[PDB]
Amino acid sequence: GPPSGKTYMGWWGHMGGPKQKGITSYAVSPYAQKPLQGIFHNAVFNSFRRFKSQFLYVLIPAGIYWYWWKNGNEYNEFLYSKAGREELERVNV
């Protein structure tokens, strides 16, 4: 077939990054390691900072929208009761 266009990823042996020189890596077989050494030292301290260094970007927008919905629901409940009957004709104009 015809050759393709120019991309930003290749294949094994010609992947297309920069040239590497001076880096050594080491690894050990999984058959020679301890079986399942995580629930502790990861539920102790690791799985608390991973979201509570991030919790303030979620809960400030969540508290704004929950305050807005709860305030509007109590005002609709007041308007259709007996005590809020006089305001109801005023705001449906």
């Binding site: 050594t24 890596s25 690894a27 077989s29 999984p30 390691q33 009761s81």
Partner: protein, 248 residues
Amino acid sequence: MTAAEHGLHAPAYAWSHNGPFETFDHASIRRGYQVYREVCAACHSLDRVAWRTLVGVSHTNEEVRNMAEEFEYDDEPDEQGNPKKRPGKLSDYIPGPYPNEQAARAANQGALPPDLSLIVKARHGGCDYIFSLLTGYPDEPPAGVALPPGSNYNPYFPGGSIAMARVLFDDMVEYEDGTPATTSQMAKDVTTFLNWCAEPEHDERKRLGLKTVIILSSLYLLSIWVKKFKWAGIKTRKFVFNPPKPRK
């Protein structure tokens, strides 16, 4: 909208089929059919229930054969072409009290009583709403409410004005097993019978769901162990950088 236009909220009762491991109470289903035949069936149809589905659930096989043989059905015409009738069998469906919709409205002041085969699943509230409607007729409406003639007050109905009157009173039905037939007992039994009419697969669905959840929970816990074993060489890999010599 106001609280009267939405209807009063129905509370939660301790039904014995609530829960992931519970079946129906089949003695309460059997008493509930007797309340249907003697009270409800004068105006309500049950069109999606066949006679054969009652065998092995609430009645024996020769009990249902005698029940279906008290009604007559249409037959194929004879050799001259004139129509005939025949008694019922187990293949037939349970018949209703009216021939068409116009005869149903003429007997109930213009209102149409609905078919009750799916009424538990077709209302918000479920069994709690059907039970609270039957036992919730006051002796008189609150002060100020003027009902039109031909209607009755019930606070659980949306709007408060319903076209059916109160039908359950104390000791109007003689039970076979000897249960006292109060208003609260008869309303509980017929709601259980109507829930089986809407959900006949209920006892089988909960037994099949227990086998599926146990098998799928074991496959989920085993896949976490296998994934963590096969990834341990990548997760503990270490790198070291030594800067190369220049002039090349």
